[PDB]
Design a protein around this ligand. Structure first.
Ligand SMILES: *[C@@H]1O[C@H](CO)[C@@H](O)[C@H](O)[C@H]1NC(C)=O
Ligand SMILES: *[C@@H]1O[C@H](CO)[C@@H](O)[C@H](O)[C@H]1NC(C)=O
Length: 212
């Protein structure tokens, strides 16, 4: 009984471009919320001052062109669609230190155009040491995310949460996570430029104690 999911798919995509920002009117902004879930601290390189982190990135937004009437599809109200088929906001890690592989994913598309996209990621980024605050062996590792393609009048980005999600991550032997607070920064240039937003997570690491 996937008959309806196929009908929907064929219907949604008869005339649909994954290159067109999916708003009904071009001067409307499209908002995206971002949540970062830390999965593991793969490597803290103190020689290069580079953090390698494994994350889950969750992006949520509305697509104006991918809606449908549940009644016309035997109640079907959600479908999983390869992510390459839909327009995406092109949110990437701005402060990559890296070179810098792909891994394919699906989005969940709800009948009201709401797209939820969970995708794994590996980030390499530079960190700054601090030995001012206890235990005097710490790292401040910023991760800054933003659209590579769109300015803030086109795509505006927001934190879903006050901080990165640290509920479940593999945990590193040398470094403890002290926090990962999130902020949003919007920069505009000179008197009159378009805005350029990002969200930044500051992962605060402190050297693990092995004493007591
Ligand atoms: C985008 O985000 C803000 C929510 O804080 C809201 O004011 C605005 O209405 C939203 N616009 C659209 C088109 O969703
Ligand atoms: C890290 O990001 C936060 C929030 O944007 C910022 O306040 C802080 O200056 C950044 N740290 C460095 C070393 O750039």
């Amino acid at each position: 009984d996937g008959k309806y999911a196929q009908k929907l798919f064929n219907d949604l995509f008869e005339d649909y471009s994954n290159a067109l920002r999916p708003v009904e009117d071009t001067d409307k902004v499209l908002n995206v919320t971002l949540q970062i879930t830390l999965s593991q601290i793969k490597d803290m390189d103190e020689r290069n001052q580079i953090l390698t982190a494994y994350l889950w990135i969750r992006q949520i937004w509305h697509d104006a062109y991918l809606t449908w009437d549940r009644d016309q599809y035997d109640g079907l109200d959600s479908i999983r669609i390869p992510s390459d088929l839909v327009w995406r906001p092109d949110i990437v890690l701005y402060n990559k230190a890296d070179d810098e592989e792909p891994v394919n994913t699906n989005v969940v598309l709800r009948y009201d155009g709401l797209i939820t996209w969970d995708a794994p990621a590996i980030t390499k980024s530079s960190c700054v040491v601090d030995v001012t605050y206890f235990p005097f062996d710490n790292q401040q590792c910023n991760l800054t995310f933003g659209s590579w393609t769109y300015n803030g009048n086109q795509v505006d980005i927001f934190n879903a949460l006050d901080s990165g999600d640290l509920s479940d991550f593999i945990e590193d032997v040398e470094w403890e996570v002290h926090g990962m607070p999130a902020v949003k920064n919007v920069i505009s240039y000179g008197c009159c430029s378009e805005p350029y937003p990002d969200v930044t997570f500051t992962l605060l690491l402190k050297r693990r104690s092995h004493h007591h």
